[model samples]
Target chain A: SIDVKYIGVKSAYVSYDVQKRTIYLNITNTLNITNNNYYSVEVENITAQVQFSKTVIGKARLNNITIIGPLDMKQIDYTVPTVIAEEMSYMYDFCTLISIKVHNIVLMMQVTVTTTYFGHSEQISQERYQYVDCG
Target chain B: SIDVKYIGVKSAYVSYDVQKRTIYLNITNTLNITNNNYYSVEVENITAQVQFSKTVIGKARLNNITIIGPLDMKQIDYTVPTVIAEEMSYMYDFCTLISIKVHNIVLMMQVTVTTTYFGHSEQISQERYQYVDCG
Candidate 1:
C-alpha cells in the first residue's frame, strides 16, 4: 500500500505555434508519495489525462520508472504535454478572453499510478486539479 | 543575524509577444530563510535581480510583508518578470538555438532580504542561480 498527496500546481503558461495556429497549455505539478510497505516497491509508471470542461485536452506522464523504499516519502514533479491544439482564431480568442476576465485557468487531471511488487502490478487512479498562473 | 539557503530552481519557461516581438523569461525560486534571534522579526521585503551573461535582464519582489518567528524556518517563493524584451528576430533566434542544443538555460540571481527590528532596517543580499526548465 502507498499514499499520494497533491501539493499544488508549480507553474503554468501558454504558447502558440505561430505557423501551426495551435496554442499550447504548458503546466507542471508537485506531488508527494509515501510508501507504507515494509519492503521496497517499484513505481512502474505515472500517467495522467487532463480535461477542461469535461473535454479531454492533454495528458502527462512520468517517463521514468521510480523506486521507493519502505516507509519513504518522495516528492515528484511532472509536466503535462502541449495541451489545447486547435485553430488559432478560436484558441487565441479563448485565451485572450480568459486572460481578460479571470486572467488564469484551472483544469482537472486524472492520474493513474502503477506499482509493482512480488512480481505483480497494481494500478491506482486519482483526480487532481492544477491552476494555471496566467490565463 | 539570519541564514539563507538556495534550494534550487523551482521552474522556468520562455514566452514572447508575437505582435510586440517582446520575449519574457519567466522564472521562480524556492529559498529557505532561518531566524536565529531569540525574538520574532519582521521581514520588510524580498527583492531580487536576474542576470544572464553578466547583463541585467529582470527584477523580482515579494509583494507582501512577511513575519518570521524566532528559531523558525520558512520557505519563500518569488518570481522574476519579463527579463528580456528585445526584438523577436534576435530574441526568437537566440531562444531557438539554445533550445535546439541545450534545451534549457541558467542565470544568476542576486536576492536582497530586508529585515526590520526595533525601528531599524537592515538589508542582506545573497547570490543564487536558477535553471530555466525551457531556455
Candidate 2:
C-alpha cells in the first residue's frame, strides 16, 4: 500500500491576474511487487494550499498528500502532463517540481493517483510555480 | 524507448554452503502516461560487479544500471527480489544497495525487463553484499 506524503508547486511563473478557473495536479508513484502482490497508484484525500516563497517570482500552490508503504519510490518521477494543472503548473518531477505562468496566474490544482491494489492516492511532493513577464 | 544500463545487488547475506543455481532479478519501472504513452519498466543489459566495504562483514555484489530518457525516472526504484542473487546478494535500493555472505559469497545475477509497449530493458543500479558466519 503506497501512500502520498506531500504535494505543492516547487517552481512556476504565474500571476494573480490570470483567470484560472481550474487546476489539476498529476501524482504518480509506484508499487514494489517484492513483498506486495498487486500494483497501481492510489489517492485517498488531498489538501490543496497556496504557498509563498521569498525567492520565488510569483504565487504558487502546494498539494499536501499522505501515502502508504511497501510503496514504489520510482513512480514519483513518472508523471504525465495532460493539462493536469488547469490553473498553470509544471509537470517536472512531481515529487518536488515547479510551475510557472506569464501573468495573472491562478492555480486550481487537483491531485489523483491510479486506482488499484497496492495503489496510492495522488500526491504533490511539493510545488514552485509562479508568474513571469514576457517582454 | 526505454533502456537498461546496469545491474547489481544493493545488499545481500548468504553463505558459501548455499547451493543457489538459478537466480532471477525482477526489475520494474513506470512509463509516465503524460507526454509519452505506454507503461512497464524495461531492462536491456546487466553489468554485475563485486565491491568490498570496510564495515561489511562479507563480500557484496553490485548491479550498475543506465537508463533512457523521455523516460520515467520513477522506474529506478520498484524492484522485485526473487532470488535474483544466487551465491548471495541484497535487494535494497536498486540504485546503490549492498549484499553479504556467511563464508563465500558468489552472485549469479540476471536482469530482464517486461516486453510491453514503452517497456524498458532491465538494469542493475548497484550491489553490495558480504559473508558473515551466523554462529
Candidate 3:
C-alpha cells in the first residue's frame, strides 16, 4: 500500500510592506509518502494554490516532488504575494474596531504518484487551513 | 472570506527503547485560522488518527481546537505509542540483512468549525505521512 499524508503547516509569516502597499506570505510545507509494500513509490507532478476568502492569492508549482524510495518525506517552502492596496484598504477600514484581524486562506496541494508493484498510478491531493494576522 | 490551509508537519521524533521493545512517536502539529470577515470563528471537535499501512496504529482526541478570535494560529503536540512487539523473535529473524528498516505511517486530523456570519459551519480534515527508522 502507498500512503500519502499532509502533515501540517510548519511555520508561517505574514508581512505587509507599508511602502509597497502589498501583503505577502511566507509558508513552510511538509509532505510524506509511505510505501508499505516491497515496491518503490514515486511521487511527482506536484502543484499548489493559496486563497484568501475563496479568492486566489498565490500559486506554486513544486520542482522536486518525486519520492525516490519507499517511505520518504519531503518539505517545501513558498513565498508568495497575497493582497494589494485595494484589498488592504478595504480590510483595514472594515476591521477598525477589531483588535486583531485574521485573514483565513485555503491552501491546496495536488500530486501524481506511481508505484512499482502492479503498475499502479494514482492522483492524490491534500488541503488545509492557514491564517495571517493584521493588527 | 475564511481561508483554511494545510501548512505542513513541524517536527517528528521516533524512538525505540531496547528494554521496553516499544516504539514511541512525538509529533508537533500546527493549525491555522484566518477570518477575513468581521465575525469570530469557533473551531471545535478536534480528533486525530494514526495509521500504518492502512492499519490503525494510534488515536488521539485534542482538547483545544477552538480559535477564539479572527486571524489566529494554534499548535498542538502529541505523544503516542506505535508498535508493540509480542513476536519480537520473528521480526528479528526476518530482517537479517537490513541494518535500518523504516515503517511509514499516516496522521489524520479532523475538526468542525462555526462562524458568526451567515450561520456557517464546516467540517475540515487534514492528513499527513511520516516514518520511523528501526535498526
Candidate 4:
C-alpha cells in the first residue's frame, strides 16, 4: 500500500500582467509519498488547478516520471498556473482589488498524482484551500 | 500489468480570432484504458497540450474524477487547447499562412493518467503527433 500526505500550500501568489491586461494565479503544493511495497513505483505526472468563487481560473500539469524505491519515501513539489482569461475582465478587477487591497484571493486548489507499479495503475487526488497574495 | 492503448488523434484544427487578434488550436484525443486489477481505480483528471515548432501554444485540463471498475475497460475522449497569445502575433500570421496554404500546423501532444487503488497510486503517460487543420 501507499500513503500520500499533503504538506499544505506555499509560494501562493497572483500575477497581474500590466501590459497584457491579464491576471494569473500561481500556487505550489508539497506532498510526501511513501511506497511500502517491495517493488519500485513510477509516477507519470502531477496536475493542479485553482478555483475562485466556484470558477476555475487556472491549471498546470507536469509529466516527469519519478521512481520511488521499495519501502522508500519521496517528496514532490508541484505548481499550478491559473489565469483570469481576457474574457473575464470583471474578475480581473475583482481579484486585483482583493489581492491588492481587500486582502487576498482566498482560493482552493486540487491536485492529482498518477502512478504505476508492477503493471498496475492508480490515481490519487486531494484538495485544499488557502489565501493567495498579490504582487 | 496496466495496458494503455493510445487511440491516436482526431478532430484537430486551429482557431483564428480576428476580433481578438489571437489564434488558438483545438484537438481531441481518444484513449482506451483497461483496469486489469481486481479492485476499482479512480482517475482524478485528464490533461492535454498542443506544441508547434517546439513551443507550446496552448493547454487544457479537466478535473472530473472518474471511477473505472475492476477488470473493466473504459474509453476516454479528451481535448487540448493551444493558443497563440497576443505577443505571438507573428506566429499568428505565420501559422495562418501555413495552415491556410501550406497544409496544417503539424502538432504534437502528450497525455497522462493518474490512478489509485486502495491508497496505492500510479501514473501513466503517452505522446503522439498529428496534423491540425485550419479554416
lDDT of each: 0.26, 0.24, 0.28, 0.29
lDDT digits (tens) for residues A1-135 of candidate 2: 223222121221111111233332343334322222233222123233222212222233334334322223464332223232222222222122223211221221111122111111121212232222221
lDDT tens readout by residue for model 1, B17-103: 233343334423232333232333332222332221121223323233333222222342322222332222321122111111121
Between candidates 2 and 3, the one scoring higher on lDDT is 3
Higher-DockQ candidate of 3 and 4: 4
In model 2, the Cα lDDT at residue A120 comes to 18
- Could you tell me the lDDT of residue A118 within candidate 3? 17
Please provide, for model 4 over B11-112, each residue's C-alpha lDDT reduced to its tens digit, 9 standing for 90 to 100.
Answer: 111221123333323423233323233433333342532221222323645355343222222342222233423331221121221111122122211122
Q: Which of candidates 2 and 4 is the stronger one according to DockQ?
A: 4
Q: Positional deviation of B32 in candidate 1, in angstroms?
A: 26
TM-score of candidate 4 chain B vs. the reference: 0.15
Mind giving the per-residue lDDT tens digits that candidate 1 earns over A13-88?
A: 3232233343334323233323232333332222432221222223323233333222222342322222332332
Q: 2 or 3, which is superior by TM-score?
A: 3
List, residue by residue over A37-126, the lDDT tens digit for candidate 4. Answer: 232344334343221112232455534434322222234222223332233222212222111112212211112233222223344333
| DockQ, model 3, C-alpha based | 0.03
Q: Best-fitting candidate, measured by TM-score?
A: 3
Quality of candidate 1 docking, DockQ: 0.02
The superposed Cα distance between candidate 1 and the true structure at residue A22, in angstroms, equals 40
Error of 2 at B119 (Å): 22
